[PDB]
Amino acid sequence: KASSXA
Amino acid sequence: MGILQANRVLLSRLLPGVEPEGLTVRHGQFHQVVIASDRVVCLPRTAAAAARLPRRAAVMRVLAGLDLGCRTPRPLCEGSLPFLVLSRVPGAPLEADALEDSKVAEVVAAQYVTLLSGLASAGADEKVRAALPAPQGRWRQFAADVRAELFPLMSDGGCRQAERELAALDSLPDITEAVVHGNLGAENVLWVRDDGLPRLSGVIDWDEVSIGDPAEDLAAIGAGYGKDFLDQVLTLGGWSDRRMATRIATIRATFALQQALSACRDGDEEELADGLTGYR
Amino acid sequence: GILQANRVLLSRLLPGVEPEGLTVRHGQFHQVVIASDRVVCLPRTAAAAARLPRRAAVMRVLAGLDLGCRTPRPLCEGSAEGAVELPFLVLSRVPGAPLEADALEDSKVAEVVAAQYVTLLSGLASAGADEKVRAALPAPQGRWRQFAADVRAELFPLMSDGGCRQAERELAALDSLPDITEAVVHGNLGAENVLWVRDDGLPRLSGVIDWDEVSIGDPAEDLAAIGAGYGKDFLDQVLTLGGWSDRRMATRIATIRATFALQQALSACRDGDEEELADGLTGYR
Ligand SMILES: Nc1ncnc2c1ncn2[C@@H]1O[C@H](COP(=O)(O)OP(=O)(O)OP(=O)(O)O)[C@@H](O)[C@H]1O
Fold first, then answer.
1. CATH architecture classification, C2-92
2. Which residue of C has its CA nearest to B107?
3. 8 Å CB contact of C77 and B61
4. How far is A3 from chain B (nearest CA, A)?
5. I want to staple B24 with a disulfide (CB 3.0 to 4.6 A). Which of B35, B220, C191, C252 is the partner?
6. Which residues of B touch A2 (CB under 8 A)?
7. How many Cβ pairs within 8 Å bridge chains B and C?
8. Rounded to the nearest whole angstrom, what is the distance from the C-alpha of residue C64 to the centroid of ligand 1?
9. Longest dimension (CA), chain C
10. Binary contact (B15, C66; C-beta < 8 A)
């Protein structure tokens, strides 16, 4: 569950 | 009233004598997190996360008993509005610029390998396996949410490109070998600096944690720090086979769409726009 | 010194850290090098190095208990537990500072500090009822009898005739103590090993350090330490709040408390700490 491009 | 004023009975119990108006509250997807000098208080922001919070505590306790070469947030107190007090991991994220110095890069890559090895080993322990989420079809669920929720927002070529990325993704093995952090971005890895070279202090934000494929954590590292640095980590840890490189590439190419899928459900317009860049 | 003689290994473990900026705590088996965020245990002998694999395991078990506070977390890989011998063991460093008894003169401070000692001791107690903790920790039998022997053998030679007579008084009751193996027992829970963050408000328990003497044993040993450091009234508040104020427990505490300076002198004697030996032997020479 990558947030903001990770 | 603020979150601080509103929660003040609980805060004077957990933080006796601490002025609430002097604290800070960070928000996340599921939790309002009150930040004190050496600990945080996690509070659910929904009825969903209030019910899940016991299990999250249980998971954090398991993580606190692993050998990862660094700290994790240790559960110090849990209760019912449920709360969970965790130790605050000290330090700050590493600026990508620090990796210019090749002695810093070596030491940092070394500490990443220790962490990833620890997570890998930990996934082989039946107990951890028994306590941690291990979803099957995590990506087919993803692909269906993207088609449903994002395709209507996309150009025809956007949809074509996304379709190609989701195809690759459907061809990955449903590996459940390692403990996978799930969101191992730079801001979730804290360091001690200014005492010689950087030392890995610890890792935070374990809400995405699962038994899974470690390529997901390696992809996140490369997204934050770039390809030379990830090559260094992959080479030091003996993970630079082409099968691993395929899994990493496949997963990384989903990062823009994951952000867009979150920002869609959030109502966050700037993240959605950024996520959809080039898909419309 | 230790820092000098171990500069190369320390330059590897703490790269770029000036080793003259580090401090050393003296242990029976290992010397402990104190850095800003971590500590490094250095075996003093081949025997000491062969004990670190099990110490690694022990510290991992402690890092998993529900104590309401932190402990030194092992920073090795789990496979270090299966080794014959380790040349070092690195542990996280618990932040905070010891608490001066002075603070306990304000009665709200005292209540809040007693409550946090109770959470710690209650967690140690319940962990001692757990068969998997029990299997991973040492649980010597006849420890009081043997300790009395060890005092007579190692400390009496350092004592005056008066000192020896006083020690004999205190060692008297030990053979009659029941031999209780029910709790995880830190075994050196003086105020210097219990660390507090007092900046933001009332004293908050950061954590506990120096677990060299940990075992499955008698909770009265840890309460004795508290009483030795803080005196009767503070102890009574801990016992009341913890549910431990019964006559049986209280009598064991009194007996153990009367040997607590001798415990400190015996440890200082075996670990080479001259100041701690002089302190511990106060009034026995
Ligand atoms: N243990 C910790 N130590 C230090 N800072 C922490 C800790 N836990 C949380 N934080 C801080 O609080 C912020 C919000 O917490 P976190 O990212 O865990 O949110 P969440 O809503 O629980 O997670 P998620 O969005 O993944 O479901 C972090 O970005 C970080 O600044």
1. 2-Layer Sandwich (3.30)
2. C15
3. no
4. 6
5. B35
6. 182-183, 185, 216, 219-220, 223, 254-255, 258-259
7. 88
8. 21
9. 56
10. no
* Those residues with Cβ within 8 angstroms of residue B177's Cβ, 6 or more apart along the chain or in another chain: B120, B123, B124, B211, B212, B213, B214
Closest chain A residue to B260, measured at CA: A4
| Sign of the alpha-carbon dihedral angle for C198, C201, C206, C210 | positive
CA nearest neighbour of B55 among B40, B39, B36, B42:
B42
Q: Which CATH number fits domain B3-87: 3.40.1190.20, 1.10.569.10, 1.20.1540.10, 3.30.200.20?
A: 3.30.200.20
Using CB atoms and an 8 Å cut-off, which of residues 1-6 of chain A contact chain B? 1-6
The technique is: X-ray
C206 labelled as ligand-binding?
Answer: no
Architecture of domain B96-276: Alpha-Beta Complex (3.90)
Using CA coordinates, name the residue in chain B closest to A2: B183
Chain B residues touching residue A6 (CB < 8 angstroms): 183-186, 219-220, 223-224, 255
Resolution given for this structure, in angstroms? 2.0
Backbone φ, ψ for residue C208 (5° rounding)? -130, 135
Residues from chain A contacting residue B272 (CB–CB below 8 Å): none
Task: Tell me how crowded residue B95 is: count the other CB atoms within 10 A of its CB.
Answer: 11
* Beta bridge pairs of residue C97: C196
Paired tokens of B235: 């080479």
Q: Please answer whether residues C117 and C196 qualify as being in contact, where contact means their C-beta atoms are separated by less than 8 angstroms.
A: no
Q: Where in the sequence of chain B do the CATH 3.90.1200.10 domains occur?
A: 96-276
Residue with tokens 């989420």: B133
Could you give the CA distance from residue B21 to residue C70 in angstroms, rounded to a whole number?
Answer: 26
CATH superfamily membership of C101-280: Aminoglycoside phosphotransferase (APH), C-terminal lobe (3.90.1200.10)
Give the span between the Cα atoms of C260 and C235, in whole angstroms. 15
